[PDB]
Amino acid sequence: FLWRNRVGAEAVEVRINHIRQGEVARAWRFDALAIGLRDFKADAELDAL
Amino acid sequence: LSTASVLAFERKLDPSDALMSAGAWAQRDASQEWPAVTVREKSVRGTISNRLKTKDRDPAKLDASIQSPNLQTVDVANLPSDADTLKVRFTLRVLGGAGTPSACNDAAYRDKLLQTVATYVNDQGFAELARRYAHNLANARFLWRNRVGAEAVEVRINHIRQGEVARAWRFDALAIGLRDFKADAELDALAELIASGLSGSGHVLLEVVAFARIGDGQEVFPSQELILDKGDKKGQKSKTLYSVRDAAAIHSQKIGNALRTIDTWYPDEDGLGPIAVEPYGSVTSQGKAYRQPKQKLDFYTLLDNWVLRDEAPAVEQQHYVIANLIRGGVFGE
Amino acid sequence: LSTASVLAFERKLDPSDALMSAGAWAQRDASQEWPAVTVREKSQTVDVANLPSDADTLKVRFTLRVLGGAGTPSACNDAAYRDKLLQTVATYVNDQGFAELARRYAHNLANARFLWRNRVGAEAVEVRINHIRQGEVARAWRFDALAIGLRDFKADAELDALAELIASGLSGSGHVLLEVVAFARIGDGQEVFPSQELKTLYSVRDAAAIHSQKIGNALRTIDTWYPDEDGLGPIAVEPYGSVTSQGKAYRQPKQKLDFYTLLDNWVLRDEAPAVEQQHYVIANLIRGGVFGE
RNA sequence: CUAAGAAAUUCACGGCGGGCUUGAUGUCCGCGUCUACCUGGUUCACUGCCGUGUAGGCAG
């Protein structure tokens, strides 16, 4: 979703928060540059999402 | 095979706005706290010193009005008293990915343009182009007038991988000229970094610190604007100076201009040195566009000779076309 | 071949702001650490300031900037106008040295031409001027404004070295950096006259200064070939030169000695205006402006 | 001397009731504005000065 804004960046981190009340019920973090822009490979904290 | 009617090219070598500060030499072990310079808008009278017209000339309105002086508002920024050196600081991103367009219409033309620029890269890479960009980053060409008549300039280029510096440089650059492109091994070490950047082989983030001694309390040269067309009143605004938040500043396009002075393969003034890379290569302050379409030399003829009909031009016109493809712009129809 | 729709020349000998400041005598060799002048307003609501009772002194602070190679211009539309101007500027350069400009610059450096209204009732004038390469000085002077009278150009022994230095300067034979500063004798409790804008005396903060253009005017009183009467003295160099103080505008355009026709003749078709005009022509090229169509 | 010459149209009124507009989306791309300077306008045709009456030493 960062279209041109991610191009040529040192570090890109994504934080995803599930909101089920006023409060947040769950909290993910990702290394967006480590996760591939091309391949849909799988791991544990991502299929937890 | 035909050119697509909508082309577009994302630029590479992205500069930012530069920010001026001020201070003395040899406090540059601890020069991370110098105060900036201030754009000062005042009112200063002038003279009546322009050409009086020949249309409706009359000594009842020119010979009587000449002895009534002018009334203007000059906006000039100046250095402080103890300060004697401008620190001009900006950053630069050598992106890379410099052969694929952002927009297109015909993927056959894009399949031809990709293999054309790849056949360019795979015998001479981005080596010599990064040599001359490292030269323009070496000398203080991006100080368009603040270097003219300096005692010493010191150019520290820092390469950045994390919060702090990963690689340093120091360049003597009043010794380095503006026409003869001699080089050095550390100039080559900068050029290898920029060539790695343009080839899509890593990230380059050059924090560019450029000192230039002028003198105590001297005059500084930031950039200028265009004040018209959206509220053009009777004209009580002469000339102001560009600024990020309460400090004077050069625009990004003028530094980009001064960094892409690469062109030396035009037949007008060959020994008289380089100019900026532009399609229909023109110094507009000179007033005369080199590289006419009357000849065979401009970018819009080289590009579609080399892409469509495979007529690969000379081994410097390749350099010029690729300097245009790093420049960007709306091509096509 | 015709005129030039845009022209832009770059300035030479630009000063900084001449801040005023005070002190005393026999501490003038310890003037790195010295006090300043004050700004106050009295009863309309206007400004007027004053020296203290301990001080006859007043002090000046500015420094200079030559560039070199002033014939070659920086904005035009005609390439042929450059190709017709290069022969003229090189013809004026190569056949004679620039010291005739340089004496008439450097004596205004040496005299009190920049101390305009700082000797309206003074007694002893002493000026000290530095040639700064680096963090110290290496060619020091200390000049006098009593000796050379403020309307003639008669040279002395100090003047030739500074003249050949500045003529190396503006011709491109080496960048010079002067610092021209002065020490005054005003009066124990005397009213000051700084600059203004377009009443409020022009107040730099916690001091008092006069702008750049007054000294960039004062150091180029080179017009003494103006037509009518040459016994009066030097006034400065202006295309369409009008002066408020002497009232009458020298060098009128309805007769042929204004800048906009001698430039046309001297530059383009290679016919020469007079050798009693040349240093005024090149002083106009030193000043700069928008010289269009 | 006019298809000339002449003329009172009067009066009265219930339009009324009902309602789901739905759903989808990449505006991308590029740029040197350039040079130049002398307000003591008189920030009141005079402020404030021995007699409120027309002659005067003052910060001029």
Amino acid occupying residue B180: D
Q: For residues C221 and C235, is the Cβ–Cβ distance under 8 A? A: yes
| Å separating the CA of residue C193 from the C1' of nucleotide D50 | 33
- Residue given tokens 């001694």 in the structure block: B213
Question: Measured between alpha carbons, how far apart are the two ends of chain C, in Å?
Answer: 13
Q: Do C76 and B151 touch (CB under 8 A)?
A: no
Domain boundary among the residues C204, C221, C238 is at C221
Task: Please choose, from the candidates B191, B82, B78, B87, the residue with its C-alpha nearest in 3D space to the C-alpha of residue B140.
Answer: B87
Resolution of the experimental structure, in angstroms: 2.9
Task: Please choose, from the candidates B215, B146, B145, the residue with its C-alpha nearest in 3D space to the C-alpha of residue C16.
Answer: B215
Would you give the distance in Å from CA C188 to the centre of its chain?
A: 30
Give the span between the Cα atoms of B227 and B238, in whole angstroms. Answer: 9
SS3 B57: coil
Give the span between the Cα atoms of B136 and B155, in whole angstroms. Answer: 11
State the DSSP code for B324: H
Task: Please choose, from the candidates C292, C263, C261, the residue with its C-alpha nearest in 3D space to the C-alpha of residue C278.
Answer: C263
Number of CB atoms found within 10 A of residue B66's CB: 19
Burial B151-160 (b: 16+ CB within 10 A, else e): bebbbbbbbb
Q: Do B95 and A8 touch (CB under 8 A)?
A: yes
DSSP string, B83-119: --EEEEEEEEEE---TTS-SB-S-HHHHHHHHHHHHH
Domain boundary among the residues C221, C253, C278 is at C221
Q: Which helix (H) or strand (E) holds A36?
A: none
According to DSSP, the residues that pair with A35 across neighbouring strands are none
Question: Measured between alpha carbons, how far apart are the two ends of chain B, in Å?
Answer: 14
Task: Please choose, from the candidates C44, C12, C9, C37, the residue with its C-alpha nearest in 3D space to the C-alpha of residue C23.
Answer: C37
Query: Residue C83 belongs to what domain range?
Result: 1-10+70-97+222-293
The number of domains in chain C is 2
| Å separating the CA of residue C206 from the C1' of nucleotide D57 | 38
Do the bridges between strand B85-94 and strand C139-140 make them parallel or antiparallel, or are there none, so unpaired? unpaired
User: Which of B50, B149, B287 shows the shortest C-beta gap to C175?
Assistant: B149
Closest chain C C-alpha to B282 CA, distance in angstroms: 12
Tell me the chain C residues in contact with residue B49 when contact means C-beta distances shorter than 8 Å.
238-240, 289
Question: Tokens for B290?
Answer: 């080199």
Give the span between the Cα atoms of B22 and B86, in whole angstroms. Answer: 5
Q: For residues C66 and C58, is the Cβ–Cβ distance under 8 A? A: no
Closest chain B C-alpha to A20 CA, distance in angstroms: 36
In this structure, the answer to whether residues C57 and C108 fall within a common structural domain is yes
Q: For residues B208 and B89, is the Cβ–Cβ distance under 8 A? A: yes
Q: Calculate ∠ Cα B62-B64-B70, nearest 5°.
A: 75
In this structure, the answer to whether residues C83 and C193 fall within a common structural domain is no
Domain boundary among the residues C221, C240, C260 is at C221
State the DSSP code for B275: B
Tell me the chain A residues in contact with residue B93 when contact means C-beta distances shorter than 8 Å.
8
Q: If phi over 0 gives left and psi between -120 and 50 gives alpha, with beta otherwise, what is residue A39?
A: beta
Closest chain B C-alpha to A33 CA, distance in angstroms: 13
Chain B interface mutation, best of C14, C81, C133, C212, highest count of B Cβ atoms under 10 Å = C212
Would you give the distance in Å from CA B322 to the centre of its chain?
A: 17
C46 class by beta-carbon count within 10 Å (0-12 exposed, 13-18 middle, 19+ buried):
exposed
Give the span between the Cα atoms of C170 and C101, in whole angstroms. Answer: 10
Task: Please choose, from the candidates C1, C173, C169, the residue with its C-alpha nearest in 3D space to the C-alpha of residue C87.
Answer: C1
State the DSSP code for B142: T
Give the span between the Cα atoms of B92 and A15, in whole angstroms. Answer: 28
Tell me the chain C residues in contact with residue B37 when contact means C-beta distances shorter than 8 Å.
none
Question: Measured between alpha carbons, how far apart are the two ends of chain A, in Å?
Answer: 17
Q: For residues B130 and B188, is the Cβ–Cβ distance under 8 A? A: no
Q: At what angle do helices C278-287 and C99-110 cross, to 10 degrees?
A: 70
Q: For residues B299 and B320, is the Cβ–Cβ distance under 8 A? A: yes
Give the span between the Cα atoms of B247 and B245, in whole angstroms. Answer: 6
Length of chain B: 333
Tell me the chain C residues in contact with residue B216 when contact means C-beta distances shorter than 8 Å.
16, 63, 179
Residues of B with CB under 8 A from a CB of A: 10, 93, 95-97, 161-162, 203, 205
In this structure, the answer to whether residues B66 and B191 fall within a common structural domain is yes
In this structure, the answer to whether residues B67 and B171 fall within a common structural domain is yes
Q: Do B149 and C211 touch (CB under 8 A)?
A: no
Residue B67 Cα distances to C142, C143, C235, angstroms: 38, 35, 15
Do the bridges between strand B85-94 and strand B204-213 make them parallel or antiparallel, or are there none, so unpaired? antiparallel
In this structure, the answer to whether residues B198 and B181 fall within a common structural domain is yes
Give the span between the Cα atoms of B138 and B210, in whole angstroms. Answer: 9
- Residue given tokens 């690689």 in the structure block: B167
Number of CB atoms found within 10 A of residue B221's CB: 19
Give the span between the Cα atoms of C58 and C87, in whole angstroms. Answer: 48
DSSP string, chain C: ----S-------S----EEE----SS-TTS-SS-------EE---EE--B--SS----B--EE----S--SS-S--S-HHHHHHHHHHHHHHHHTS-THHHHHHHHHHHHTTSSSSSS-SS-S--EEEEEE-SSSS-SEE--EESSSS-TT-----TTHHHHHHHHHHHHTTS----EEEEEE----TT-B----B----B---TTSEEE-HHHHHHHTT--B---SS-SSS--B---TT---SSS-SPSS-TTTTTSHHHHHIIIIIS-----TTSHHHHHHHHHH------
In this structure, the answer to whether residues B201 and B283 fall within a common structural domain is no
In this structure, the answer to whether residues C87 and C129 fall within a common structural domain is no
In this structure, the answer to whether residues C126 and C261 fall within a common structural domain is no
Kindly calculate the radius of gyration of chain C based on its CA atoms and give it in whole angstroms.
Answer: 21
Do the bridges between strand B165-167 and strand B153-160 make them parallel or antiparallel, or are there none, so unpaired? antiparallel
In this structure, the answer to whether residues C47 and C105 fall within a common structural domain is yes
Q: For residues B25 and B56, is the Cβ–Cβ distance under 8 A? A: no
Number of CB atoms found within 10 A of residue C146's CB: 13
Q: For residues C148 and C157, is the Cβ–Cβ distance under 8 A? A: no
Number of CB atoms found within 10 A of residue B13's CB: 26
Q: Strand D: which nucleotides have any atom within 7 A of a protein Cβ?
A: 26, 28-41, 43-44, 59
In this structure, the answer to whether residues C212 and C230 fall within a common structural domain is no
Task: Please choose, from the candidates C212, C213, C180, C201, the residue with its C-alpha nearest in 3D space to the C-alpha of residue C37.
Answer: C201
Give the span between the Cα atoms of B132 and B261, in whole angstroms. Answer: 8
Q: Which nucleotide is nearest to B46 (CA to C1')?
A: D37
In this structure, the answer to whether residues B207 and B69 fall within a common structural domain is yes
C68 class by beta-carbon count within 10 Å (0-12 exposed, 13-18 middle, 19+ buried):
middle
In this structure, the answer to whether residues B19 and B76 fall within a common structural domain is yes
User: Minimal Cα distance from B269: which residue of C?
Assistant: C79
Question: Tokens for B296?
Answer: 């065979």
